[PDB]
Design a protein around this nucleic acid. Structure first.
Lengths: 178, 45, 231, 133, 60
RNA sequence: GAAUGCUAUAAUAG
RNA sequence: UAUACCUCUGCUUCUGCUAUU
RNA sequence: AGUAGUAACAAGAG
């Protein structure tokens, strides 16, 4: 019953319930009114004086110190380069390696902030390039009858995706069952 | 403990081994024949 | 300007080593190039002392195929590499590590050397850096007005002492030639605010991530900050 | 050794009001912050890769010297030696239900000290601090 | 909260649970929450915090 | 007569 | 084609966040 | 068949 519109970024069918018509029944509603939230937050701020800025301070000071390796501790993360789940530590690596190809070396600086700058910047890239491995046959000498052996060697190949295709992947969520 | 540095991994490894060798020579752990190879191999980096 | 000046005088080795050293402390090489020159000079002065200084198998100094110098450069090398070298030497020879990072170290003397370039007086600047060290490193201070103030045990030879004074007032003339000497005279001071600017794409996404009855994000920001929704 | 050179009193049945308080799980040789401990551990095992000498180095000079001499004769992996020293320098301080016994050497035996409806007298071994007395 | 009850009155406890919690809570509200909380923070940090909710509001 | 605040691969909880 | 009555595999056939730390 | 239960296994692959 909220505001339905088309996203001019992705072309997706966006629905917005906020500041919507109040419910007429006890069925679940997402139609939360901003003013009522802001008032509730104000009341909280009054009864807990100067906590918001106190927390915002500590949070901000924490960010400055926070390194990138902080992202290498969270089970299975969605990897946009291969469009399947990978271990958190590898998901980061794959993103860092791919970011370098598009001239994004914020991760090298060590802190989380410059890496984060690269993430929101990467959305502005017209095409995003990333490595994806392909196998190659190669003759190798051996104590064989014919005197050789074929073995498959992997080699990184540069794949491209468009501005939108990358954005959607960035905004993507992989689904499972609990 | 987590090693810190925005410089190259190779750079770090080179210097440490260079130092180790220099000190190993002057101390008397490493020989001249070995120290020849040490600095020679490190030169190739 | 200072930006194009350093390209002519100094090599790209000295440039990038100083830029990295300056980057570690999180200060922009281009926005504060006066501080870059200081470190550049600090590095070039240091590298000239250990250019042709070597040691033989017997254990004596000579002027130079062969690889084992008399001095060990510490300034220019990244923090953790520089400290590793400083600790490694101290432990091997058997002396206490200085609390502050050194610039050079003599293999024959077996002591740490602290270098310092100063604008005004050389002798007075020796006593400024005698407060922190005391007797930790053998200081070797130099200034631009052709003045030297070394420690009592000065290993620096008179021939080598000249090369410092040459470059001290070779580039000093080059700074006055192009009328860029006046750039370093002024007091350059500014804090490096951590800015985080949003691009075009993400900004558009934020504008469409707005509750109903809002044109763009700017509208939402002001509304939340300004208006009071009591009752 | 603390369990071995101990003495057990009597078990007693009756109501025990347990209070949930933040207590030390394991007796430390010397207590330090994580960072101070980490640097002390570095000085023992990995002198070269220590970094900037902190004043903390001088404060625990005898501990480092002592430990470095004791662990000198060994063929155990340094990473194991690291975590062992960390275990007896870094404090393990966590919330537990206690009832009249906060001392670590008591806490380590908290399971045998009491329940909700019973209490067992237990005397640890070795030494006990005068401040805790 | 027990003892501070008015004498000669009734203190009651609603053993509660919220159904369709994740399904109903909207990112755009969480964006508002950050903007309110980061009132007196510098402009970069206000914008930093605002991204995570914004991304969720356009999630696929 | 107090403190010292953190970071697991299990399990539970939401 | 076929080798193959052979060879390889037994969470990988998408397993999240947070707290107890 | 059966296990099982809002969708699967009851072998998969070179």
């Amino acid at each position: 019953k909220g505001k339905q519109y088309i996203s001019d970024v992705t072309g997706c069918t966006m629905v917005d319930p906020t500041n919507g018509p109040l419910p007429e029944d006890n069925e679940p509603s997402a139609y939360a009114q901003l003013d009522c939230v802001l008032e509730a937050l104000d009341r909280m701020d009054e009864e807990h004086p100067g906590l918001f800025q106190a927390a915002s301070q500590n949070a901000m000071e924490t960010l400055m110190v926070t390194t990138v390796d902080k992202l290498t501790q969270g089970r299975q993360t969605f990897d946009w380069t291969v469009c399947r789940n990978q271990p958190a530590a590898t998901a980061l690596n794959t993103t860092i390696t791919s970011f370098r190809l598009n001239d994004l070396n914020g991760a090298d600086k060590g802190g989380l902030i410059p890496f984060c700058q690269d993430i929101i910047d990467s959305l502005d890239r017209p095409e995003m390039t990333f490595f994806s491995v392909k196998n190659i046959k190669k003759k190798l000498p051996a104590k064989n009858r014919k005197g050789f052996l074929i073995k498959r060697i992997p080699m990184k190949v540069k794949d491209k995706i468009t501005k939108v295709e990358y954005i959607k992947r960035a905004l993507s969520l992989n689904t499972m069952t609990k | 403990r987590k090693p810190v540095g925005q410089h190259s991994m190779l750079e770090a490894m080179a210097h440490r081994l260079r130092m180790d060798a220099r000190l190993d020579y002057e101390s008397g752990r490493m020989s001249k024949d070995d120290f020849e190879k040490a600095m020679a191999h490190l030169g190739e980096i | 300007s200072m930006d194009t000046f350093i390209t002519r005088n100094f090599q790209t080795t000295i440039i990038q080593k100083a830029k990295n050293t300056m980057a570690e402390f999180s200060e922009d090489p281009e926005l504060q190039p006066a501080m870059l020159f200081n470190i550049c000079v600090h590095l070039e002065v240091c590298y000239v002392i250990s250019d042709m200084n070597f040691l033989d198998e017997e254990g004596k100094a000579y002027t130079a195929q062969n690889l084992r110098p008399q001095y060990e450069v510490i300034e220019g090398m990244p923090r953790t590499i520089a400290w590793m070298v400083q600790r490694s030497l101290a432990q091997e020879h058997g002396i206490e590590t200085p609390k502050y990072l050194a610039d050079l170290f003599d293999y024959k003397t077996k002591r740490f050397i602290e270098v310092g370039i100063t604008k005004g007086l050389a002798d007075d600047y020796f006593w400024k850096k005698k407060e922190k060290l005391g007797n930790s490193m053998e200081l070797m201070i130099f200034s631009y007005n052709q003045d030297y103030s070394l420690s009592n045990e000065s290993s620096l030879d008179e021939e080598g002492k000249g090369r410092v004074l040459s470059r001290l007032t070779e580039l000093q003339a080059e700074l006055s030639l192009k009328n860029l000497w006046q750039v370093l005279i002024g007091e350059e001071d500014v804090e490096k605010g951590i800015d985080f600017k949003l691009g075009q794409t993400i900004s558009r996404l934020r504008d469409i991530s707005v509750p109903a009855g809002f044109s763009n994000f700017e509208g939402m920001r002001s509304y939340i900050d300004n208006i009071d929704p009591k009752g | 050794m603390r369990l071995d050179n101990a003495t057990w009193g009597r078990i007693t049945f009756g109501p025990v009001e347990r209070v949930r308080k933040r207590v030390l799980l394991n007796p430390l040789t010397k207590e330090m912050p994580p960072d101070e401990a980490s640097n002390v551990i570095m000085e023992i095992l990995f002198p070269k890769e220590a970094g900037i000498p902190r004043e903390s180095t001088w404060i625990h000079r005898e501990l480092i010297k002592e430990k470095r001499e004791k662990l000198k004769g060994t063929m155990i992996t340094p990473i194991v030696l690291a975590y062992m020293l960390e275990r007896e320098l870094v404090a393990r301080r966590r919330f537990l239900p206690v009832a009249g016994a906060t001392s670590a050497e008591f806490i380590e035996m908290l399971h045998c000290l009491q329940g909700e409806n019973w209490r067992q007298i237990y005397h640890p071994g070795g030494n006990k601090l005068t401040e805790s007395r | 909260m027990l003892s501070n009850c008015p004498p000669g009155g009734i203190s009651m406890t609603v053993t509660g649970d919220n159904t369709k919690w994740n399904e109903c809570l909207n990112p755009r509200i969480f964006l508002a929450m950050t903007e309110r909380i980061t009132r007196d923070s510098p402009i970069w940090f206000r914008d930093f915090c605002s991204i995570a909710p914004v991304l969720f509001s356009n999630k696929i």
